[PDB]
Specification:
heterodimer, A: 214 residues, mainly beta, Immunoglobulin-like, 2 domains, 6-stranded mixed sheet, 4-stranded antiparallel sheet, 2 helices, 18 strands, B: 226 residues, 7-stranded mixed sheet, elongated, immune system/dna, antibody, Fab, carbohydrate
């Protein structure tokens, strides 16, 4: 089979930049090389076919070049809506094979997270469980640390963290942190705090509640 | 415009069977070749199978990975594409896309490419059983306020398989919603969803999450309360 390689699996660029994504085929594919965009929500569309032909309806900032085994997708003057994963595909011989994808992040100005904390619900407590949840919303860059402090002591067991995709509108990220305890463990303590550490602040952004006041 | 709507995705055990469907509209279905293309979670695209038009006697082609296990077929009268999947394997776990082939090669080139894509239907091949989620409201505790905004949520815990859909106010609140990708922990998924609104409009006006988990026939609504 013909192996398609996109040697860069991820990249980060700014609005207005030139973005070049490369694709190499294991053998000559006679310019039967196509490019697709997959948006974060999973929607796929064709951009370019037969190396350089622009699909009707696709903006002219997308162009393709190459011959033989070596091909490139260029996005000139990168726009906000171009956050996506890009795939090449040869159509010369069966099976028709795809490259591994190149994920494109778009930069933006640094932004501090908005932090929200939530106690366990009555419903869950009744069932004998206790999940405390912290949201850190709309921050940049993606790297962020969240710590749980229970009565002032850090707690790491039972914590699970989930980052959103980059927001297609404003290029921010969001993350959820969930601390899951037994009901009996929950009732044993009073102060529940989530602290966010991020390059946007020298001191953490903190949210807290007290069990016996909720 | 072109619509390709996949259905039939769901949980199946190893060595089991499942049939996918795709309902096409907005183009002359019977003049085009059709494909299935798939995508394993967090992975890239893999072409699965092709069926040509009636004018080319419905010639079929398959990727070696699925050959003799999968059968691609079409019903032109109903503008439907099918994929019968037998003797399923763990590594068949994927989102499955219905895909219309490129048109006339004299205009579009001989090389194969994929002109229109559906949104996909998810197939999960796993020994684990279906488990509905527990849904819990995420309400701020009493005695704190920032005058401008409040953020609420729903926690969706301990389900299998993917996926779930959370809507806020029957889809009315779309703009302000974050969805947190599910995480698998000891055989079960958990995810959450958040919505942010004007501090005025709630609690004065009602905010409800509706959580669907089709695999377990569950739909749960949690009205959020102070």
């Amino acid at each position: 089979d013909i192996q398609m390689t996109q040697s860069t699996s991820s990249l980060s660029a700014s609005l207005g930049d030139r973005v070049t994504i490369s694709c190499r085929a294991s053998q000559d594919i006679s310019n039967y090389l196509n490019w697709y965009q997959q948006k974060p929500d999973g929607t796929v569309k064709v951009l370019i076919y037969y190396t350089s032909r622009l699909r009707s309806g696709v903006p002219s900032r997308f162009s393709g070049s190459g011959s033989g085994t070596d091909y490139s997708l260029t996005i000139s003057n990168l726009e906000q809506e171009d956050i996506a994963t890009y795939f090449c595909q040869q159509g010369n011989t069966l099976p028709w094979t795809f490259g591994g994808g190149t994920k494109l992040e778009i930069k933006r100005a640094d932004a501090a997270p908005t932090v929200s904390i939530f106690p366990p619900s009555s419903e869950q407590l009744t069932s004998g469980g206790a999940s405390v949840v912290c949201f850190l919303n709309n921050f940049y860059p993606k790297d962020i640390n969240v710590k749980w402090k229970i009565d002032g002591s850090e707690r790491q067991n039972g914590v699970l963290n989930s980052w959103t995709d980059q927001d297609s509108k404003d290029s921010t990220y969001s993350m959820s942190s969930t601390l899951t305890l037994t009901k009996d463990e929950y009732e044993r303590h009073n102060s529940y705090t989530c602290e966010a550490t991020h390059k946007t602040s020298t001191s953490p952004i903190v949210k807290s509640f007290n069990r016996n006041e909720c | 415009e072109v619509q390709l709507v996949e259905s039939g995705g769901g949980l199946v055990q190893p060595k089991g069977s499942l049939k996918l469907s795709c309902a096409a509209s907005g183009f002359t279905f019977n003049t085009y070749a059709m494909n299935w293309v798939r995508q394993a979670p967090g992975k890239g695209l893999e072409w699965v199978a092709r069926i040509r038009s009636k004018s080319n006697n419905y010639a079929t082609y398959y990727a070696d990975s699925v050959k003799d296990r999968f059968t691609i077929s079409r019903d032109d009268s109903q503008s439907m594409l099918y994929l019968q999947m037998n003797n399923l394997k763990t590594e068949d776990t994927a989102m499955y896309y219905c895909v219309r082939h490129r048109g006339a090669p004299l205009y579009y080139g001989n090389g194969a490419w994929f002109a229109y894509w559906g949104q996909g239907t998810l197939v999960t091949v796993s020994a684990a059983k279906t488990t509905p989620p527990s849904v819990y409201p995420l309400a701020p505790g009493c005695g704190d306020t920032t005058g401008s905004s409040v953020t609420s949520g729903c926690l969706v815990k301990g389900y299998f398989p993917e996926s779930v859909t959370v809507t806020w106010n029957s889809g009315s609140l779309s703009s302000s919603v974050h969805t947190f990708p599910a995480l698998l922990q000891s055989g079960l998924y958990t995810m959450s969803s958040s919505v942010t609104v004007p501090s005025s409009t709630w609690p004065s006006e009602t905010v409800t999450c509706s959580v669907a988990h089709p695999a377990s026939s569950t739909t749960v609504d949690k009205k959020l309360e102070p």
